């Protein structure tokens, strides 16, 4: 009795809610280039804070996805449009000795170029995956997407790379960071910590596996949704990073055509010809697969585990896809996913790989991009961190897992699992035995 109402401000109590998060860019770079300012995020471990997490449900993954789209749109906006290049192609492609690999070879056509009364013959090379065959004589070809979308050449001076990004909440909202070392994507976290901003997440763009990300604290971690076994994607996150290396040993020649926007095409190739390929530490790879199999048969009690390469679908999912700088790759990944199971740099694997220029935009089709050729020979090196698997149902008595993960949002889904955002509720009340004085 006599417990008079009292009020308290600055209260530590919060709730879940969506909000618009700040991005943050590096101090050096090539909206994004100079801003927002590079932070110095701190972090406290909180004593007894118990919070639940859900890496499938949280909103900010969608915001990452939208921001990536918007930034790509802004970067691509001032670049040239390749619409006048849509003319009929009359090409036979038998000049160089190693003809069959590319089969677009000085590939001829007409362009309007300097004077609009004039029309001039030109030619350049193309990889046949960027080409479709018209009816009648095979010499008649067309650009692949030109009957369905408008193609923009990438701005060569604005080459973009997986620059790390830190995400910062606004005032009144705090980002909760689970420090648990064996978090499965759902359930309580007893090791809650808070920060101004997230660490520097990179916008990696790849399929069937991811190339640049973080690593797990424990052993290889399995994360999947648990509403039903009939899942879309299963995320496997490596603790032991494994190196992968790739090469494009042939030397390219850049050539230019002006519309006065400078269109770039592929000139004559220099040096003897090889098919672009990759390399993998052979023992390390299927040591890691053995670890992943041992982890994976924990969930599934008493059934075999086996891998096969993906079947059907576009080139973006039938092959591992990634990019060394300003070139794009599609590596025929049959050998890597052919083990089977039941209830340290020797013997290096190599795998064949193809490259193509005209890329349907990753998140969604209907808008087309053209990457100008990169001169000379190219290699890039990365160290993978996880796999994107999907389970083939139906087959009784035998599980089967195959490389999928073509949907671009899953890459950032597998990396933003750390965090959650909460609205602060600074105002609260309580009973107490003291009242105002008149």
């Amino acid at each position, epitope marked *: 009795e006599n417990l008079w109402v009292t009020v308290y401000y600055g209260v530590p109590v919060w709730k879940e809610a969506k909000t618009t998060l700040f991005c943050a860019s590096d101090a050096k770079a090539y909206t994004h280039a100079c801003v927002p300012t590079d932070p110095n995020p701190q972090e406290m471990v909180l004593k007894n804070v118990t919070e639940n997490f859900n890496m*499938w449900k949280n909103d900010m993954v969608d915001q990452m996805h939208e921001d990536v789209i918007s930034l790509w749109d802004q970067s691509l906006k001032p670049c040239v449009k390749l619409t006048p290049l849509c003319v009929t192609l009359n090409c036979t492609n038998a000049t160089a000795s190693n003809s069959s690999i590319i089969e677009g070879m000085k590939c001829s056509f007409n362009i309007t170029t300097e004077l609009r009364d004039k029309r001039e013959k030109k030619n350049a090379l193309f990889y046949k995956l960027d080409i479709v065959q018209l009816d009648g004589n095979s010499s008649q070809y067309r650009l692949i997407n030109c009957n369905t979308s408008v193609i923009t050449q990438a701005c060569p001076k604005v080459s973009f790379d997986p620059i790390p990004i830190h995400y910062c909440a606004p005032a009144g909202y705090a980002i909760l960071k689970c420090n648990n070392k064996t978090f499965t994507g759902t359930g309580p976290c007893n090791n809650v910590s808070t920060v101004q901003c997230t660490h520097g997440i990179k916008p990696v763009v790849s399929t069937q596996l991811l190339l640049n990300g973080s690593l797990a604290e424990g052993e290889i971690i399995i994360r999947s949704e648990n509403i*039903t076994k009939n899942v879309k994607t299963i995320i496997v996150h490596l603790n032991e990073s494994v190196k992968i290396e790739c090469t494009r040993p042939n030397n390219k020649t850049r050539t230019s055509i002006r519309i006065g926007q400078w269109f770039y095409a592929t000139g004559q190739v220099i040096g003897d010809i090889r098919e672009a390929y990759c390399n993998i530490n052979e023992s390390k790879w299927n040591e890691t697969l053995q670890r992943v199999s041992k982890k994976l048969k924990e969930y599934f009690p008493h059934k075999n585990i086996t891998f096969q390469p993906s079947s059907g*679908g576009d080139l973006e999912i039938t092959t591992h896809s990634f990019n060394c700088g300003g070139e794009f790759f599609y590596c025929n990944t049959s050998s890597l996913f052919n083990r089977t199971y039941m209830a340290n740099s020797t013997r290096t694997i190599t795998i064949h790989c193809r490259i193509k220029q005209i890329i349907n935009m990753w998140q969604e089709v209907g808008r087309a991009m053209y990457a100008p050729p990169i001169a000379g020979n190219i290699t890039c090196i990365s160290n993978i961190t996880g796999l994107l698997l999907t389970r083939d149902g139906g087959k009784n008595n035998t599980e089967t897992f195959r490389p999928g993960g073509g949907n671009m949002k899953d890459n950032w889904r597998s990396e933003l699992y750390k965090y959650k955002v909460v609205k602060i509720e600074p105002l609260g009340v309580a009973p107490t035995r003291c009242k105002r004085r008149v």
Partner: antibody
Amino acid sequence: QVRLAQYGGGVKRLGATMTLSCVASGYTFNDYYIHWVRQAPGQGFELLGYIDPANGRPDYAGALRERLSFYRDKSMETLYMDLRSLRYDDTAMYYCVRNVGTAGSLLHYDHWGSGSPVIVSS
Amino acid sequence: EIVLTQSPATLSASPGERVTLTCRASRSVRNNVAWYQHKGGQSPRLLIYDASTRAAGVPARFSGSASGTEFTLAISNLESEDFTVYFCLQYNNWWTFGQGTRVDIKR
């Protein structure tokens, strides 16, 4: 509002290969998995497989993985199914059905297609 | 691997009654069950998509509930139009379909 029309079918001769199709009315082509389910006469339904329209990934029932094939043409918002070497028992009606998918799981079917009867006989 | 035995084969009733349909799971399927209406040779239609939650646009007379591994669809007022076929469905695992049950006029 959403419609899933179908074409193809009719009679097909024994041992032949046949092609169905479904045209997705405008809801959003890339957001919903599509499943191909059928019904033999005097029997309950069963599933053949599902195709993700976005990336074109198929997946089949274990008893028909040699004979089936799915693929799409995203520009036309159109789907196709190829079944090879029709046998007698495959005389049945074949349906398209939209699937309601969450961010990480597939749940159930909401809108069925208009149907496509097929009869195997020479 | 998961088989839905839907029982009984046929249910006789008169208009306006409460009528019950049952779906038996071979083993556990959580709440991952649904129900559909099947017209006289047309597109099937959705009635109840979780174990109890009615689908949008369905009349309120349709209802169902979880019973552990058994699942039950109940229609409060079996109208003239509802004398047709209904089938249950599970989605905890690979997809499967029940045999379906007819509802017909009593005499």
